[PDB]
Amino acid sequence: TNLCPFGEVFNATRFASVYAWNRKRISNCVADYSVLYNSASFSTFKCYGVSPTKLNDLCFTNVYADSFVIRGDEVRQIAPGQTGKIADYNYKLPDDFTGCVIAWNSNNLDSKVGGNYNYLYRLFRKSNLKPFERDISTEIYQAGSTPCNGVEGFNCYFPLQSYGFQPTNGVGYQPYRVVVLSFELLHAPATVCGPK
Amino acid sequence: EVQLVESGGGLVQPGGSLRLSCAASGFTFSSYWMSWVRQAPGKGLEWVANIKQDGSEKYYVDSVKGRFTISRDNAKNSLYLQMNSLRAEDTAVYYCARGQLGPWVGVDYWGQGTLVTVSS
Amino acid sequence: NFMLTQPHSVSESPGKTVTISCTGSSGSIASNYVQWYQQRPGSAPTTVIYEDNQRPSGVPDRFSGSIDSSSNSASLTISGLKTEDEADYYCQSYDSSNWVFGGGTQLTV
Ligand SMILES: *[C@@H]1O[C@H](CO)[C@@H](O[C@@H]2O[C@H](CO)[C@@H](O)[C@H](O)[C@H]2NC(C)=O)[C@H](O)[C@H]1NC(C)=O
């Protein structure tokens, strides 16, 4: 049975930023959840809407996967419902999710002694986003008055700030790769399904 | 139905070597996680160790690690636990436990348990 | 240091409903699944409620639970409160390559 490429989703050498999270779909294979819950490297395996007990029995047509890097104090912010700098900005999750959330700690792989500066995030936006949007534009923020029109002076700040990753801080400041799995079914024949 | 009987040693053994075996039957052994939980007399529950379904992974806590080893054998549908250098706080009853889905959801079937007493 | 705080002997009601709350200290308990185990001293325990809110087969529908993220605590509710419900329940939560356990609540009637 053709097996879905769950390896390259999790065992990826490079991970994108939270504000530029990737989206990869998978179809027409056989899903293997038995390699997911039989491991212990992850720190959060919570599934909203679909219980993990019947994960190997309940099976749908399309599966969506995301991947981005955050730290330890906003892992609860990824969950649907609560607010924060990773919730009202960058990523955003709907309230009717039928998927799962993956989280593990990778400190040595995602950081070195000199301090990582390759990760960015949206500090501030005009407003919140839809349950599923991507924000790539780096336009300057609009204060109550916006006379900068191209400069970075007063009342006009850069929305992107570098992300501090140093190996000797606390648990909540360490990098935390997060993978979000999305499950939904349409009016189409099932493509990926559990082994029999 | 499930049968989880064990043959642990309740004999007094101050700082020696004793092995516990928790037999399993009624289900496929090499498909689910295994774990060990311990309760002191008159106190609450506590966790000791857990082991992957293939024996590749094993975890303990700070106090129990370094003196407790655990390895399962899926061919004979049984598991073994061996400890050395016992101390005073090890007077408790040891229960062998099985996992419903892995390390996340937790225990689903509970064993009978043998009482282990260490003194001088 | 994910210690779980649970009161002792907080259920002293012969009738009405029962409420038991167990909270966490180091981090949010809503990130991982938290369950309760019904234990009969002098006998083997059994699972009364698993996952967040999932009742196992054979467990009566009187037992129910809830998750509140405001106080970072998990609740357990018993409806019938018969004589069989005498037990001590321990809240168990998942940690990174570790397992924690609650103090327990001795239910007297
Ligand atoms: C990501 O890579 C790791 C390491 O290569 C994989 O872990 C191994 O997976 C094989 C496949 O069954 C096992 O035989 C090994 O015992 C595993 N080793 C360890 C240390 O866990 C992991 O499976 C890969 N991830 C995916 C989704 O394939």
Residue numbers in the entry:
A (entry chain C): 333 to 528
B (entry chain H): 1 to 120
C (entry chain L): 1 to 109
Task: Provide passages from the article that reported this PDB entry.
Among CDR loops, HCDR3 dominates the contact with RBD, the hydrophobic HCDR3 loop, containing residues L101, G102, P103 and W104, probes into a hydrophobic cavity formed by RBD residues Y369, A372, F374, F377 and P384. This hydrophobic contact is further stabilized by surrounding electrostatic and polar interactions, distributed in two different patches: the larger interaction patch is mediated by hydrogen bonds between backbone of RBD residues S375, F377 and LCDR1 residue N32 sidechain; a cation-π interaction between RBD residue K378 and LCDR1 residue Y33; a charged hydrogen bond between RBD residue T385 and LCDR2 residue E51; and finally a salt bridge between RBD residue K378 and LCDR2 residue D52. The second interaction patch is mediated by a hydrogen bond between the glycan attached to RBD residue N343 and HCDR2 residue K52; and a hydrogen bond between RBD residue N370 and HCDR2 residue Q53. Finally, RBD residue A372 is contacted by LCDR3 residue Y94. Notably, within the epitope, residues S371-S373-S375 are located at the entrance to the identified fatty acid binding pocket of sarbecovirus spike RBD.
